[PDB]
Amino acid sequence: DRVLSLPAVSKNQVLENVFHTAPKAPVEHLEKMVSANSKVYDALNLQSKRVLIWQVKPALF
Amino acid sequence: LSNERYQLLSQWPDFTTMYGKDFYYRAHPEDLKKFYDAADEYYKLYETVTEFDSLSALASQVVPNYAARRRSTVHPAIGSTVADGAFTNFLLSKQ
Numbered sequence: 001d002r003v004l005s006l007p008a009v010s011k012n013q014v015l016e017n018v019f020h021t022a023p024k025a026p027v028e029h030l031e032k033m034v035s036a037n038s039k040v041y042d043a044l045n046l047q048s049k050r051v052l053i054w055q056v057k058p059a060l061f
Numbered sequence: 062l063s064n065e066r067y068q069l070l071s072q073w074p075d076f077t078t079m080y081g082k083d084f085y086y087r088a089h090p091e092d093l094k095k096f097y098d099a100a101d102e103y104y105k106l107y108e109t110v111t112e113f114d115s116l117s118a119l120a121s122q123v124v125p126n127y128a129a130r131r132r133s134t135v136h137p138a139i140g141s142t143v144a145d146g147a148f149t150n151f152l153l154s155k156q
Binding site for chain 1: 077080082085090093094097100104107108111112113114116117
């Protein structure tokens, strides 16, 4: 019964209690806000090819 | 109206200042999964409030019901306050 003197908690159960959650990448905040601010650029810039300024305030000609 | 909702996603606390592993390992494993879910939620809210190419098709859900109320058989500009004021003239005169 030498196995009953070994630590009963497995090496697996250490690696799933220490590494419980997949950690958040540093770059996943950049490349997720950048793709969402690229829609703020598109709609709201005045130099974009798809501005909403002629759709929401139609021009007086 | 999207600007009034974007202004309150502007005032969201920077959760990415707590992504380091000295916050990962000091924190309860369930309060860290809630924190990583509250950060995934902000990207859900922010990527849909900046979907401004969807506002032009939401405006077409307001137009056809408004335009049918203007196709009134009485007048385009009729309302209740005028049509009640013209019932007072109709009722409180002789027959």
